[PDB]
Design a protein around this ligand. Sequence first.
Ligand code: CTI
Ligand code: CA
Ligand code: CA
Ligand code: CA
Ligand code: CA
Lengths: 90, 89
Amino acid sequence: MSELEKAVVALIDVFHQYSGREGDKHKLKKSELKELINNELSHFLEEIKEQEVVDKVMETLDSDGDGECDFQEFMAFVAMITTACHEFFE
Amino acid sequence: SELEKAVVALIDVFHQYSGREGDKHKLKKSELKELINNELSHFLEEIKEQEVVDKVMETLDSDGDGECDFQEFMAFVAMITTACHEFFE
Ligand SMILES: *c1c2c(OC)c(OC)ccc2c2ccc3cc4c(cc3c2[n+]1C)OCO4
Ligand SMILES: [Ca+2]
Ligand SMILES: [Ca+2]
Ligand SMILES: [Ca+2]
Ligand SMILES: [Ca+2]
């Protein structure tokens, strides 16, 4: 695969990894969203060490309101990060 | 991490193709066509007609400026990734 294709695959891969740990296997609960951020985005986002912060992060990302982050909400999260970085460099 | 590498790859591939012609920060039809044909060949059928690149740009150009900017590109990446995730469930 091309670099863009591996990137597409990794996003699906990483979401699946964290979402399939607890509860709903197709969604990220707070604990799952926290660890994904802490382990996998450690160079982009400040490590989450407060319950208020993980609550705020989930409130921001959960557009439908079921208290978890589904794949579509996760892709919206990836879009903000990538777009912010792109706007910075270009 | 793998997610971080993916974020960087998305920014780089867009920059790569957008920076060929015209506005270096956007994809014109020719740039978008080449990105799809060269970089997404295992997921999308190769574009071989003008009518197809015209319709693809029409779909992705949410603002109407005739080109695909980065957020429009991410919406595109989002379409593909979501489609594949939904495939497994
Ligand atoms: C998803 C994938 C993945 O991502 C997990 C992998 O992992 C090895 C393999 C293949 C695919 C896809 C295969 C075909 C396909 C076709 C179309 C898509 C998306 C895919 C795949 N996505 C990228 O969108 C429109 O047609
Ligand atoms: Ca879960
Ligand atoms: Ca949700
Ligand atoms: Ca361009
Ligand atoms: Ca546009």
